[PDB]
Amino acid sequence: PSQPLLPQHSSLETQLFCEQLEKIPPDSEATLVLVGRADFLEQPVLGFVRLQEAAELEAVELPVPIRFLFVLLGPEAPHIDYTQLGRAAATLMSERVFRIDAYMAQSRGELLHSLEGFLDCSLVLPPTDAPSEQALLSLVPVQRELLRRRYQS
Amino acid sequence: THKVYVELQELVMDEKNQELRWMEAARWVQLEENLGENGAWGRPHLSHLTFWSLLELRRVFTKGTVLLDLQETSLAGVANQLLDRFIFEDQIRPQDREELLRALLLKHSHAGELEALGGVKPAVLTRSHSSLETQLFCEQILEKIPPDSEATLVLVGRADFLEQPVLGFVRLQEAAELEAVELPVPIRFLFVLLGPEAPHIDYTQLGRAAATLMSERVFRIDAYMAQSRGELLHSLEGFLDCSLVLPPTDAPSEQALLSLVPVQRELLRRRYQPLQQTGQLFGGLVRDIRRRYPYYLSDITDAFSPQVLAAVIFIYFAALSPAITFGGLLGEKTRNQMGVSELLISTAVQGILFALLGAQPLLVVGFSGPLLVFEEAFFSFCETNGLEYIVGRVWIGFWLILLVVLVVAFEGSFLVRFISRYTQEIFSFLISLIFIYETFSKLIKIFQDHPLQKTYNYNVLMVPKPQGPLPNTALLSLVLMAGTFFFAMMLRKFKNSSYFPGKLRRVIGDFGVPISILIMVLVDFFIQDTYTQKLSVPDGFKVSNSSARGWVIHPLGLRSEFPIWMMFASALPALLVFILIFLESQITTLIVSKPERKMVKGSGFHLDLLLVVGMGGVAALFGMPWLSATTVRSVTHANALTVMGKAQIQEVKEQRISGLLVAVLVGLSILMEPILSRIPLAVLFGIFLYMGVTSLSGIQLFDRILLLFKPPKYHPDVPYVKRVKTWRMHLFTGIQIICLAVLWVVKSTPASLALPFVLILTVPLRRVLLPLIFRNVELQCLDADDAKAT
Amino acid sequence: DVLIKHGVMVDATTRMGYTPLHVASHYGNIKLVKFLLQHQADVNAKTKLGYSPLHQAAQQGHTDIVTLLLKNGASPNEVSSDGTTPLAIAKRLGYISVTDVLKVVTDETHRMSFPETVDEIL
């Protein structure tokens, strides 16, 4: 082990939602996303694995078979938060058009094409000095057409 | 601190007049307002951004062109300084400067004038779907702007002639109300985003991202107090750190957006706190003339640089010293029928004519070792048979002109295409090795003449040369040779170094050999007592033996009537001389004109051979030596004119002036005896060692010989290493070393004139026997005409 | 794969106009839907009653075939001869997920289509 050299920033979701299994469908399959830091590795690496048959692994305690494996390992680099990288990978896996595309992918190019439309239909909200909560509602049409653009070709 | 009003303008066309102009597209006061078709401003809305917009904004801001506190009050100046700082930072080419400032100085239209134009359509600059915001907010100012407000103008355009997208960020020293672009508040910041059509670059989205960045208070303050591009970049990284991305989700839109409120409130908490055969007679000769003579004006103007002058000073000694040495030996071996003066005059005249007329002016023409051996043998042949040596040569030269005219007429120089990198590199490596060996053997001879003894006879006669050993002579000669080599190599290193201003450093590196020669000649000059051998030129422009022959040799005989049978029998020596000169000159032309040496002016194999052999035949009539395009001298001449990039050969100073001046100085070497008589040969020995070691740079055979002593994990990333097994490459290299050893053995035998034929035998070895033990891919990677990956 | 390599027509139609893409969308076989769409099946093919391969997937509740069909060019708002668009067949049998996805792509505005089957058995 070791203590990370780069400064530690507390998880935003932990500071927001944490501080205070029957919903799983019966035929659902599990996806495991593993993020780790390794000073010895030259560059961050991505490992995506789809199993031929869904298998129960000791990694997941739930009785949900594992189909997909996400492995994101790398050294400490600026603008790289591996918790946030794993969150992004898990959110991408949770997306509908991406899942169905990961299930049907026969090459890395299909997965890359699917992640491009996720980014094309993603709404980036820049910092503003006055959060009004009403100018936010003005972007409802924007959200609806970026979804019509992901659900459509 | 000032409040902002951001204005985004785009390059468009009007339907009525088809005139390019900058059209209003969006404005920022407190929220984004977009201008749609029919000229009605849309609903104010939060400035949402796309992922690619901010992506490419960061990308072009990293290489951004940033002008701060620019002291201009008009758009035309802002536009001229920016387009200049663009050229200075190499963002755009100087040719596309004009067109871009013609674009930046078009009329800037606004919302009111849109209706009078009869419509506006998007346009792309030439060198000579509707927007999401319009679709979602536009289908259906002065009061809001604060009094102490300053405006930002974002100029967005598409220009296909640009190679890359270009960002220009300009901040004015004082807020200016530009006359070209009318705004309610004066312009302070000016964003210029231009570039071609590229994937993921929507320039409207790039301008929207830039305008949203400028509307942000923290980035606005940072850009207000920014002093370099790095501070702006850091503020942009903070902006992206606080940027929040909402992925495409199926949740209800109102709740989905309202969930982002606490995330935003937390996220912003601390933020605000040549060789082809034509088939026509003389076809290659004519094509060589047409290829090179158009460059004749450039062949004179390209020499206006100090590098050419340094090359002249280098190659002058590099050509004069072999001339003097070979002329002295030639006279010793022929009883001065030919000698130093004849060789100097022949070298000068042929060099002048070749530099003025040849299609490869970078070749240096002079007498070589093989050519000396050929003479010495003919002389003895003539001595044995009672024949006049000079008259035989006049007949050999007569037959030389016949052979070259027939070869040039039938394009016989197209056979040089079968000489691959294999034979070229074997020949070049062998000639460099012989050069270095002879340079060291001269120093060994100096030590043998003046050995280190305990006692010397202090009374030793010095004229013409010392008749006994002298103290301090051989050791000082070694010191001078080593010092010249040391200073030359150190100045060559200093040329590529990071010391001194770059222009001065490159000038000093160019003159490295002349500076080393000057330093060591001064060192020898300030040592009066010790003797060192100096350069010796004849007293005047006269024949070496005035009792043997004059300037013109009668073909029918000087003292005895020249036999008719030897007039016809001179063809065989003429064939031998033609083969020697042809192989030397053509392989030299191949080596100096490699595609990897960046010679973009062309070389003529048929013209240069014609000039060299014909001039040799004519010089035979005057009792003067026939010459050849020497390898080390010409390679040194090419390397002295080679300009390096920022490691990589950038260009070559291809011109005719350097060789012409070298030949002129060789001709004038007799008149400048007071200068040459104070130059020791040892300094020239060090220069020769420098030439020999620097002549090995471009030879892949020498590179692979060094890989015989390196671990394979250190081998370079080249096609013949990454595509061939290491032991296979070593077998290929060792086969060439066998050829080098066989060629060296032939040189050290009386049959050294058979060396061209043994060298030619490498061509069957490459084209026949090598495919028996190597595959096609291995041979392509190893023996490649242009060093390409098969 | 073997049938397509032999030269079998991808868009062969039955008596009532059903294509293999129609049957694959009806029975929820997405890997074969992907295969047929890779081999140039008509995503907007219509039967004699005007039913698309997207009306079958929505009448049978296959939300992932609805997705993969929409992403491969399936055209919503197309109306069958019965007068039903894929989003109403959805709402009519109350498939919340198929309706939830077809609701985003469908603009503002009692017969079930069944492919022919083989009952042979020995």
UniProtKB/Swiss-Prot annotation, chain A:
Detected in erythrocytes (at protein level). This is Band 3 anion transport protein. N-glycosylated. The modification Phosphoserine is found at residue 2. The chain holds residues 184 to 349 of 911 of the full protein. A dimer in solution, but in its membrane environment, it exists primarily as a mixture of dimers and tetramers and spans the membrane asymmetrically. Component of the ankyrin-1 complex in the erythrocyte, composed of ANK1, RHCE, RHAG, SLC4A1, EPB42, GYPA, GYPB and AQP1. Interacts with STOM; this interaction positively regulates SLC4A1 activity. Interacts with GYPA; a GYPA monomer is bound at each end of the SLC4A1 dimer forming a heterotetramer. Three SLC4A1 dimers (Band 3-I, Band 3-II and Band 3-III) participates in the ankyrin-1 complex. It is found in: Cell membrane; Basolateral cell membrane. It comes from the Eukaryota. Changing residue 89 to D: In SPH4; Boston. It is linked to Ovalocytosis, Southeast Asian: An autosomal dominant hematologic disorder characterized by ovalocytic erythrocytes that are rigid and exhibit reduced expression of many erythrocyte antigens. Clinical manifestations include mild hemolysis, intermittent jaundice and gallstones. However, the disorder is most often asymptomatic. Residues 108-153 are annotated as: Dimerization arm. Belongs to the anion exchanger (TC 2.A.31) family. Functions both as a transporter that mediates electroneutral anion exchange across the cell membrane and as a structural protein. Component of the ankyrin-1 complex of the erythrocyte membrane; required for normal flexibility and stability of the erythrocyte membrane and for normal erythrocyte shape via the interactions of its cytoplasmic domain with cytoskeletal proteins, glycolytic enzymes, and hemoglobin. Functions as a transporter that mediates the 1:1 exchange of inorganic anions across the erythrocyte membrane. It comes from Homo sapiens.
UniProtKB/Swiss-Prot annotation, chain C:
Regulated by phosphorylation. Palmitoylated. ANK repeats lie at residues 16-45, 49-78, 82-109. The modification (3S)-3-hydroxyasparagine is found at residues 44, 77. The modification (3S)-3-hydroxyaspartate is found at residue 11. It comes from the Eukaryota. Isoform Mu17, isoform Mu18, isoform Mu19 and isoform Mu20 are expressed in skeletal muscle. Isoform Br21 is expressed in brain. The modification Phosphoserine is found at residues 75, 97. It is linked to Spherocytosis 1: A form of spherocytosis, a hematologic disorder leading to chronic hemolytic anemia and characterized by numerous abnormally shaped erythrocytes which are generally spheroidal. SPH1 is characterized by severe hemolytic anemia. Inheritance can be autosomal dominant or autosomal recessive. Patients with homozygous mutations have a more severe disorder. The 55 kDa regulatory domain is involved in regulating binding of SPTB/spectrin (beta chain) and SLC4A1/erythrocyte membrane protein band 3. The ANK repeat region forms a spiral around a large central cavity and is involved in binding of ion transporters. Adopts a T-shaped arrangement, in the ankyrin-1 complex, in which ANK 1-5 repeats are orthogonal to ANK 6-24 repeats, with the peptide binding groove of ANK 1-5 repeats oriented toward the membrane. The rearrangement of the ANK 1-5 repeats orients the canonical protein binding groove to directly face the membrane, to interact the membrane-embedded targets RHCE and AQP1. Component of the ankyrin-1 complex in the erythrocyte, composed of ANK1, RHCE, RHAG, SLC4A1, EPB42, GYPA, GYPB and AQP1. Interacts with a number of integral membrane proteins and cytoskeletal proteins. Interacts (via N-terminus) with SPTB/spectrin (beta chain). Also interacts with TTN/titin. Isoform Mu17 interacts with OBSCN isoform 3/obscurin. Interacts with HIF1AN. Interacts (via ANK 1-5 repeats) with RHCE; this interaction mediates the primary membrane attachment site for ANK1. Interacts (via ANK 1-2 repeats) with AQP1 (via the N-terminal). Interacts (via ANK 1-13 repeats) with EPB42. Component of the ankyrin-1 complex, a multiprotein complex involved in the stability and shape of the erythrocyte membrane. Attaches integral membrane proteins to cytoskeletal elements; binds to the erythrocyte membrane protein band 4.2, to Na-K ATPase, to the lymphocyte membrane protein GP85, and to the cytoskeletal proteins fodrin, tubulin, vimentin and desmin. Erythrocyte ankyrins also link spectrin (beta chain) to the cytoplasmic domain of the erythrocytes anion exchange protein; they retain most or all of these binding functions. This is Ankyrin-1. The lineage of its organism: Eukaryota, Metazoa, Chordata, Craniata, Vertebrata. The gene is ANK1.
